[PDB]
Design an enzyme around this catalytic site. Structure first.
Site, PDB file in Angstrom:
ATOM      1  N   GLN A  70       0.569  -1.192  -0.053  1.00  0.00           N
ATOM      2  CA  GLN A  70      -0.269  -0.406  -0.372  1.00  0.00           C
ATOM      3  C   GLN A  70       0.724   1.202   0.091  1.00  0.00           C
ATOM      4  OE1 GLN A  70      -1.141  -2.635   2.484  1.00  0.00           O
ATOM      5  NE2 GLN A  70      -2.979  -3.560   1.194  1.00  0.00           N
ATOM      6  N   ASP A 119       6.888   2.741 -13.386  1.00  0.00           N
ATOM      7  CA  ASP A 119       5.870   4.143 -12.645  1.00  0.00           C
ATOM      8  C   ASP A 119       4.332   4.746 -12.849  1.00  0.00           C
ATOM      9  OD1 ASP A 119       9.124   6.137 -13.748  1.00  0.00           O
ATOM     10  OD2 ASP A 119       9.059   5.188 -11.905  1.00  0.00           O
ATOM     11  N   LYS A 161      -3.937  -9.091  -6.393  1.00  0.00           N
ATOM     12  CA  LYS A 161      -4.160  -9.984  -7.280  1.00  0.00           C
ATOM     13  C   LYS A 161      -4.899 -10.580  -6.897  1.00  0.00           C
ATOM     14  CE  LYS A 161      -2.448 -10.590 -10.746  1.00  0.00           C
ATOM     15  NZ  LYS A 161      -2.666 -10.355 -12.103  1.00  0.00           N
TER      16      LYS A 161
END
Ligand SMILES: NC(=O)C1=CN([C@@H]2O[C@H](COP(=O)(O)OP(=O)(O)OC[C@H]3O[C@@H](n4cnc5c(N)ncnc54)[C@H](OP(=O)(O)O)[C@@H]3O)[C@@H](O)[C@H]2O)C=CC1
Ligand SMILES: NC(=O)C1=CN([C@@H]2O[C@H](COP(=O)(O)OP(=O)(O)OC[C@H]3O[C@@H](n4cnc5c(N)ncnc54)[C@H](OP(=O)(O)O)[C@@H]3O)[C@@H](O)[C@H]2O)C=CC1
Ligand SMILES: NC(=O)C1=CN([C@@H]2O[C@H](COP(=O)(O)OP(=O)(O)OC[C@H]3O[C@@H](n4cnc5c(N)ncnc54)[C@H](OP(=O)(O)O)[C@@H]3O)[C@@H](O)[C@H]2O)C=CC1
Ligand SMILES: Nc1nc2c(ncn2[C@@H]2O[C@H](COP(=O)(O)OP(=O)(O)OP(=O)(O)O)[C@@H](O)[C@H]2O)c(=O)[nH]1
Ligand SMILES: Nc1nc2c(ncn2[C@@H]2O[C@H](COP(=O)(O)OP(=O)(O)OP(=O)(O)O)[C@@H](O)[C@H]2O)c(=O)[nH]1
Ligand SMILES: Nc1nc2c(ncn2[C@@H]2O[C@H](COP(=O)(O)OP(=O)(O)OP(=O)(O)O)[C@@H](O)[C@H]2O)c(=O)[nH]1
Ligand SMILES: Oc1c(Cl)cc(Cl)cc1Sc1cc(Cl)cc(Cl)c1O
Ligand SMILES: Oc1c(Cl)cc(Cl)cc1Sc1cc(Cl)cc(Cl)c1O
Ligand SMILES: Oc1c(Cl)cc(Cl)cc1Sc1cc(Cl)cc(Cl)c1O
Ligand SMILES: N[C@@H](CCC(=O)O)C(=O)O
Ligand SMILES: N[C@@H](CCC(=O)O)C(=O)O
Ligand SMILES: N[C@@H](CCC(=O)O)C(=O)O
EC number: 1.4.1.3
Lengths: 501, 501, 501
Positions: free
Chosen positions: B84, B119, B126
């Site tokens: 995250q 980038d 997933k």
């Protein structure tokens, strides 16, 4: 917890489940509210049961924490939600290196079956953080539990109406306090019921009287209900009652300590207490209060003066009742033929393997199952939750009214009789007995917890007996329990709009 | 398969990671913004890297669905969120019996490393649902994906700002549409950005131009960037360019079909196409358009008239470039010594084992890594997401303004010159070239996708080359890629306050 | 600050306000969109102005934190929101013992007037935590800012669309990072724009290029705009330009250091730098880079080798330009007659008292007001916020398209001319100049910040000049600024259910 017979805890419970699934499958096709028939009704039951067995959700977490010495460490955690058939999931949080996805899934499913047995409207859930608490400081533990709460909160694994944790191995009031505080200070800061996000809280933080000792008290009641039947004790070769009984408990924590305190109170004498280091023994009994002090001051039961360091597995000691109150799979095919006890009272979750259950059925050993016997904890957790939703202390609004009320009721009989037996009788004081005097203002919090728990353990105990009878299961109480549980969980999927073809 | 080096997919990627972790560990202690020094800086880097490797969250689900024939079935699903470090997690959803907790964790981490390489500001994620789509009807599949979305939504595993899925194996526009619709109709019904909860959506539902073929287009560019360097082709014994090259692709789906379409466009000829049933072959080449029609009408490539049914592993065929675009671990220690190809262009995720990578380094075979080569899909998914947040068709507000503007700019040079070269010159029409005429009104959505993708694949390609050079990694581009990726993920963890001063 | 003139900081700003309120009160009754007339229009304007002056909200906080040595401490904090006429409030966070309810209210109102001057759509806000940062460890400071964020968040004093903090005295990237992290990990965990809750963040956390030096860069531009007018420099007795100018800055932090860096770049030489300990001096100039290194390694500017410890108030030193970049009320009635400088460039907020302003008007000293001069920080904070909302790096989607586009545009003129001047001319290469070559792919983040800031400082500068002229205010730029500001804020009231009904 073993080598030869170390079945996967989850599969082990599924075994216990499947066993009862067979026994009741018929009463289910019977009570099936379907217009269709035969194999379709048979099939539908199987489909529903296939839904109940697997856990619906399992969250695996990996989060970092800054140790006191500046270093970074990654700790693992899990929380499984077995069933949502009853909206708020319920289940404790264990801190141990033994925790794993499977252990937590197993415990989670045991929670829902136990809640069903004991009629508590929660689906089961369980959490585990893979750490040995003793290798961390209080400050690191706080960071660990607070951070774990937030990760659970963000993914919907904690909340008054979604999932309500509680203590378990190596967690207690302190951790629960941290959890409540983290939740209420962040995500639930606007929630009027924010503090009901967790149970087992300290009394001063919205916790409830007797929750700490609730499991022990419940263990007492569960044993009491069977140990006073004769129709059961005759088969074990024992006399009813506690007065002439001896017991040994493996584990001296929240479950073990209090189970021991309560049994000792009604005449039973504790012959041996066990822990991870080892155990102690004394045929004349050991006093729960003294042992707790020694443990409190020395950090261990070993070396206790009024007893001797026992060398030979606490589970094999000689006694009437054995109470394993530690972790799972402590009684297996290997040590089972050596228990010496006639009654196995499962304080812990899953302490006996399926294979060990057989040997116990043959040797005519009664195993009071965990999903009924240790449910005193969840039962009182349910009371804590209810208290948090009501925001009042039970009785507070009614004490004076019921007191004044009972005196006028008693005065009504007094006056009616003085009216009848005019001057013949004279004054005829109608006064409460000492016992009723203590119940004059109605029930308080403590009162409700005690009587509510005793009631629950008794209602469920009869339910189990009636079921053991109806299927001639003898001393296979575990199967009778799962039968009752599957029946209750079934009622929800069955009669439900869902499953109406 | 092949039975030899079939490693834990997750461990396999961790291997790829650890390799690069070693190579850059020094540039990290260097760029470490710490006032402390030596081993503490060395230690801090190791701690941070230990955080990045494990997936932060993994949700395992077990939910029921009513099959078309009335019966009940329990299907399993998972969604892992690796990182995250960049707020919205990003990653596709695979439908296959091969899916499992580990496969999904591995894929999830590959997503974050690939986003870093390319980038794209998303942490990796997933999902996988354990089913073979072919054994279900469209109606059952719809119920399966819609229900799966809700379960993910309730636990925070999908949302515009939390986690954005996309297609993968056996899922496409259709499934994405169902996902978006379920989310927007329930949880996100008030969210202005509700449709950005997922990408790879049909164009008419807020999807973006060229997303379906985006991976193939990207595969083309990734191969182009290296196949035109000479400083790389000299080492393989090949001439730069596509005109005299032959290729074979394993997989004829979204990746394979388009990779093939684009390579064939620039002169390369497809010598063989493979699938699960088997493969086909023709040394004179196979046309992508005809093969797609045959497949479309017959459901299989086998039996195609302008080619022959090949018998001998599509991966071992003779060709210049091999494009595995199916599933993971297709190239191992066993078949590696037999590739015959000088360039392995990984369209699929994790198609080559670490052990196979060695053999490829020895035989001087260049492996263009997956975390760079197939990133064209996520890159364009990022554009779809951005489009959904802006709620406008790129160019719509500026077409007329830029058109009128360019003509006045050109008129300014025309008039300036007519002003100078008065009557000597005469009229001096300054007109756009045919190419500039097509760019006269500025970029449209299609324009931005194409030029944005080409730009990204080029920028990242150079970055990888520069890194392969700085560490003399030769044809070990994979390691250069992870090096670049660890460097970038590192930067969000470094910063003071973040991993603390 | 004195004992003589140390007006209440808030009252002081209200004074500045009331002054401009008088000057424009007429243009307001003119532009008043009312059907009514005379005194009612005069009265309505007064009522609206009475609304704008007082701060709408002020939150005073008192929260505890556990110090590193186990002890408990209560720290005080405040955040005032002056105006919500523009939905997101904007303003920094100061850490100092000098902070108080009034200081914060004053700063908050200066924020809204400055945003208006510079055309940034935010109402003003400001926060202060009463502590001396130097008396706490990094770990305690982190706990302090994170806890402060949560308290602000729970009461609606921070959020992407409600109130966006930033750095100020003794706070920087580090604190901003902690704030963003606390917000995004708790309350804004579902918010796609969570990181826009605060600005001045580190670049790797969503911060923007040049934000740290943005105020200094802006101070340069603000001085440039006036120092090159002649119509203003003739009145001071100075020549336009920086080449032959000397300056002295009080404060060597984010404002002072960069103001100094930029002025030194264009030829001006720094004659003295001041701090709380004292100041240093050198008539031949001091180099910004060397001074920063000394300060960095020694923690103080005093004792710098290429200069001497000055003894006599940095504000009274002899120089062309004086830049107070520390705290408020540093120039009062007492020291004002001794500035020696012709230009006072207010880098800090409220550094000069009203009474000091008079003396400055008499001695013909131009005071470039703070609400215009230091607004470079908020301006770039606005860009950071915008960047966070767009989730893309400026230029990323368009670099290749604009590059290819400009070459085709240039090729169109080349081909048109070769078409005309057929073989006479030959090849007529149309190539970019070196300067245009750097602008070939269009603007990048860094480009937009620089050109956007320069543009803003220039647009606002002219606006102020035009206003100083229209009212013959001479060198009273402050009043011209408040006039422009009241005009812009009042417009919002002259149409929001306010002048109406
Ligand atoms: N509210 C609750 O906490 C409830 C708990 N339970 C059940 O009881 C168990 C929880 O006990 P709590 O978690 O209550 O116990 P607590 O952690 O206090 O138990 C502590 C005791 O467990 C002993 N112990 C642990 N492992 C072993 C072992 N392998 N052999 C012997 N002794 C051991 C410890 O010895 P040492 O300290 O040296 O490790 C210690 O005396 C759970 O498994 C749960 O199923 C059921 C219902 C409610
Ligand atoms: N946006 C995207 O879709 C992206 C996809 N990728 C990569 O490509 C894969 C996704 O493919 P999509 O999901 O694109 O593919 P799609 O399902 O279209 O692929 C269909 C093809 O896969 C073939 N296939 C499956 N298993 C095997 C096998 N064991 N041997 C040979 N062929 C096989 C199928 O043959 P059959 O039909 O008979 O089963 C069919 O031709 C992912 O693993 C991912 O790493 C990479 C980047 C982005
Ligand atoms: N983003 C921003 O930060 C913006 C800031 N500004 C302006 O700049 C000021 C903020 O400065 P920041 O807060 O940027 O400064 P920072 O805290 O870095 O300033 C540090 C400097 O302030 C000096 N200082 C403080 N008090 C005194 C004093 N009484 N006498 C002499 N020197 C002193 C310090 O010396 P020491 O270390 O010994 O205390 C140190 O050199 C504000 O007033 C504001 O108007 C304007 C717009 C944006
Ligand atoms: N360890 C320990 N805990 C106790 C003791 N007495 C009370 N407690 C605490 O209070 C709870 C136990 O309450 P009980 O002592 O069983 O209440 P009770 O005495 O049975 O109530 P009555 O039957 O009305 O007298 C636990 O949760 C403990 O935290 C004690 O003697 N030892
Ligand atoms: N029905 C059908 N669709 C296709 C086929 N090939 C590609 N497509 C789809 O649409 C592209 C079709 O592109 P156009 O045909 O619209 O593409 P284009 O603009 O000429 O592509 P470029 O030449 O790379 O710029 C891909 O995104 C595919 O999803 C095909 O053979 N049949
Ligand atoms: N404290 C400080 N920061 C600086 C200085 N010079 C540049 N910066 C930085 O500006 C950085 C990135 O700057 P560059 O793109 O390399 O700056 P320039 O090289 O474009 O910077 P300028 O000379 O300020 O225009 C931020 O990360 C700031 O830390 C300096 O002298 N002191
Ligand atoms: O996660 C934490 C961080 Cl980043 C910093 C500190 Cl000083 C503590 C913690 S634990 C924690 C405690 C609370 Cl009251 C809320 C959250 Cl959200 C926490 O993570
Ligand atoms: O979950 C479903 C149930 Cl119990 C019944 C039906 Cl006739 C469909 C579904 S799938 C589904 C579809 C949507 Cl539009 C929303 C949700 Cl909440 C679903 O689960
Ligand atoms: O408030 C705190 C408490 Cl009770 C415990 C710890 Cl260890 C830290 C803090 S500061 C803090 C940090 C975060 Cl991330 C969130 C919140 Cl609500 C905090 O108060
Ligand atoms: N872990 C215990 C306690 C759970 C609860 O009270 O909710 C069971 O079993
Ligand atoms: N699931 C694919 C694509 C990810 C995406 O675009 O979200 C891999 O890579
Ligand atoms: N508080 C600083 C500016 C911070 C901001 O960007 O809001 C003054 O001006």
């Amino acid at each position: 917890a073993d080598r030869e017979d170390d079945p996967n805890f989850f599969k082990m419970v599924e075994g216990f489940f499947d066993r009862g699934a067979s026994i009741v499958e018929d009463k289910l096709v019977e009570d099936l509210k379907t217009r269709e028939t035969e194999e379709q009704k048979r099939n539908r039951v199987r489909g529903i049961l296939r839904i109940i067995k697997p856990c619906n959700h399992v969250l695996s977490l990996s989060f970092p924490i800054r140790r006191d010495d500046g270093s970074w460490e990654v700790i693992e955690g899990y929380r499984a939600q077995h069933s949502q058939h009853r909206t708020p999931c319920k289940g404790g949080i264990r801190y141990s290196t033994d925790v794993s996805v499977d252990e937590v899934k197993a415990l989670a499913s045991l929670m829902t079956y136990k809640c069903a047995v004991v009629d508590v409207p929660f689906g089961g859930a369980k959490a585990g953080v893979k750490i040995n608490p003793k290798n961390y400081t209080d400050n690191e533990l706080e960071k660990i539990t607070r951070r774990f709460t937030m990760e659970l909160a963000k993914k919907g694994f904690i909340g008054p109406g979604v999932d309500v944790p509680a203590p378990d191995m190596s967690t207690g009031e302190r951790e629960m306090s941290w959890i409540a505080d983290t939740y209420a200070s962040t995500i639930g800061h606007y929630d009027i019921n924010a503090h009901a996000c967790v149970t087992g809280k300290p009394i001063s933080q919205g916790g409830i009287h007797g929750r700490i000792s609730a499991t022990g008290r419940g263990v007492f009641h569960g044993i009491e209900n069977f140990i006073n039947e004769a129709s059961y004790m005759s088969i074990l070769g024992m006399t009813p009652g506690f007065g002439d009984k001896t017991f040994a408990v493996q584990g001296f924590g929240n479950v073990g300590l209090h189970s021991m305190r309560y049994l000792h109170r009604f005449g039973a004498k504790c012959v041996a207490v066990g822990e991870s280091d080892g155990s102690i023994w004394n045929p004349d009994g050991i006093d729960p209060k003294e042992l707790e002090d020694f443990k409190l001051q020395h950090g261990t039961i070993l070396g206790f003066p009024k007893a001797k360091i026992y060398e030979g597995s606490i589970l094999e000691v000689d006694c009437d009742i054995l109470i394993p109150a530690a972790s799972e799979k402590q009684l297996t095919k290997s040590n089972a033929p050596r228990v010496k006890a006639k009654i196995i009272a499962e304080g812990a979750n899953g302490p006996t393997t399926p294979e060990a259950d057989k040997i116990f059925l043959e040797r005519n050993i009664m195993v009071i199952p965990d999903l009924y016997l240790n449910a005193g904890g969840v039962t009182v957790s349910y009371f804590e939750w209810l208290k948090n939703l009501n925001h009042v202390s039970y009785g507070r609004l009614t004490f004076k009214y019921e007191r004044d009320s009972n005196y006028h009721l008693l005065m009504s009989v007094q006056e009616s009789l003085e009216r009848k037996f005019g001057k013949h009788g004279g004054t005829i004081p109608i006064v409460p007995t000492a016992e009723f005097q203590d119940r004059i203002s109605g029930a308080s919090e403590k009162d409700i917890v005690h009587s509510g728990l005793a009631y629950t353990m008794e209602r469920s105990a009869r339910q189990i007996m009636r079921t053991a009878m109806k299927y001639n299961l003898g001393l296979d109480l575990r199967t009778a329990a799962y039968v009752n549980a599957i029946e209750k969980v079934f009622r929800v999927y069955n009669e439900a709009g869902v499953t109406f073809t």
